[PDB]
């Protein structure tokens, strides 16, 4: 059957050229490195020198996958991905991957969905008509600013999401199990809150607010709003100031 194989300790960076895509999948322990822009696609693969042979860079339907292919690697040193495109509506990270978008994004819709401990950082400006944001599996995501018409953030089981700085015009936060929404930074005029078990949201309605509590869980709020409220259990909804 297929070889096991694990790298050499050399590390080595090839760069090829790159087909469109608009979407990314992966899973593993992967540095990966993503801006938007015009230029020509490339791709950059830093990984143990003996193990550029294994690495699969496929794209079908416009969906880039990255990872291992025709042997099991039993270990690697680093692996790093640093690619553009000139569009981004979807990302898919798992296992305990850095994802980094070192550019701002733009776009009708971004859907993010961040499980098994990967990180997700957006450091720039994000500008779209929707974003969709999940995390499971204690991963984490950390979005520096943001604009945008509907956003939609949830978690289930366990991870946090922190929204930095910005704006929507609709949010929709929910927790389930547990959780951590860090968002007192994005003003929303109307925002719909549940929490589902344990766990904390930090929001900040400008208008109204619904809020639904099953559990131990917490919503915590920045004003003035109004307030809808339906809690059953030891959480509460108040306002901090």
């Not at 690619?83 to 979807?90: D, F, G, I, R, V």
């Not at 994004?105 to 720039?124: H, M, T």
């Not at 991963?139 to 930095?164: F, P, Q, R």
Request: some cysteine; glycine content about 10%.
């Amino acid at each position: 059957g297929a070889d096991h194989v694990k790298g050499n300790g050399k590390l080595s960076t090839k760069k090829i050229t790159i087909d469109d895509f608009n979407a990314i999948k992966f899973d593993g322990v992967i540095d990966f490195n993503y801006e938007q822009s015009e230029s020509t696609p490339h791709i950059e693969i830093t990984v143990d020198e003996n193990l550029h042979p294994y690495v699969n860079i496929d794209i079908q339907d416009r969906v880039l996958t990255v990872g291992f292919k025709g042997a099991k690697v039993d270990h690697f040193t680093k692996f790093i991905v640093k690619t553009n495109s000139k569009w981004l509506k979807e990302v898919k990270a798992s296992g305990n991957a850095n994802f980094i978008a070192n550019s701002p994004l733009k776009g009708d819709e971004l859907k993010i969905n961040a499980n098994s401990n990967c990180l997700v950082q957006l450091k720039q400006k994000v500008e779209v008509g929707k974003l969709d944001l999940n995390v499971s599996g204690s991963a984490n995501m950390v979005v520096n600013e943001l604009k945008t018409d509907k956003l939609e953030c949830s978690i289930n089981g366990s991870g946090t999401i922190n929204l930095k700085a910005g704006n929507a015009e609709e949010a929709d936060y929910s927790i389930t199990t547990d959780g951590e929404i860090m968002a007192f930074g994005v003003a929303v005029p109307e925002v719909n809150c549940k929490i589902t078990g344990k766990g904390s949201a930090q929001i900040h309605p400008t208008d109204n607010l619904k809020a639904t509590i099953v559990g131990k869980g917490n919503i915590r709020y920045k004003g003035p709003t109004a307030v809808q409220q339906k809690v059953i259990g030891k959480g509460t909804v108040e306002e901090v100031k």
